[PDB]
Design a binder for this molecule. Structure first.
Ligand SMILES: CCCCCCCC/C=C\CCCCCCCC(=O)O[C@H](COC(=O)CCCCCCC/C=C/CCCCCCCC)COP(=O)(O)OCCN
Lengths: 83, 71
């Protein structure tokens, strides 16, 4: 409690550069695990169509695959518009 | 016959001459400077977040234009 307080006071008095470096590094290490937007970043990376979407041969047993891009089936990027 | 004339100090004396160190304080507190820096950083972060999200949307749009034109 007080030992670490005195150590931090001495470090702030003598090496503010190292104190700031360690604080920034620790924040960069720990904060991403608590953020709700990391999943949004992953989804944004997943939603970028780098290559052509190859169509599937219809066999009459794919109710969740669209037959046209404007059909309601398939993934939606409405969440991205409002983000 | 006239009075003796010589280079002499004026009657009374001379005005006081300053010699001591004069370095005024002339500065803000550390907390104020650090707070200004952190606020500037937060404002920039929020602005760039919006701008990069919009840029990602635009990139997706032109990628889809490519996908439409590919066949
Ligand atoms: C968990 C974070 C890890 C990742 C982030 C860090 C990334 C980069 C930072 C690390 C770089 C390497 C730094 C290595 C430190 C060397 C220490 C040392 O030996 O230097 C001492 C001096 O430094 C010391 O005083 C020894 C250590 C003192 C403590 C330093 C910081 C320790 C942690 C402080 C902050 C903790 C976290 C921040 C919380 C803030 C509180 C809210 C010798 O000084 P000289 O230059 O040789 O003197 C010549 C003239 N006399």
């Amino acid at each position: 409690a007080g030992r670490i307080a005195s150590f931090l006071k001495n470090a702030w008095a003598k090496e503010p550069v190292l104190v700031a470096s360690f604080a920034i590094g620790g924040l960069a290490i720990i904060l991403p695990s608590l953020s709700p937007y990391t999943n949004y970043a992953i989804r944004i990376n997943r939603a970028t169509p780098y290559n052509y979407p190859v169509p599937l041969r219809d066999d009459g047993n794919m109710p969740d695959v669209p037959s046209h891009p404007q059909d309601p089936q398939g993934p939606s990027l409405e969440w991205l518009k409002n983000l | 016959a006239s009075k003796v004339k010589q280079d002499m100090p004026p009657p009374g004396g001379y005005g006081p001459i300053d010699y001591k160190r004069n370095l005024p304080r002339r500065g803000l507190s550390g907390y104020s400077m650090f707070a200004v820096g952190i606020g500037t950083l937060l404002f920039g972060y929020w602005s760039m977040m919006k701008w990069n999200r919009e840029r990602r949307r635009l990139q997706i749009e032109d990628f889809e234009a490519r996908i439409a034109l590919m066949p």
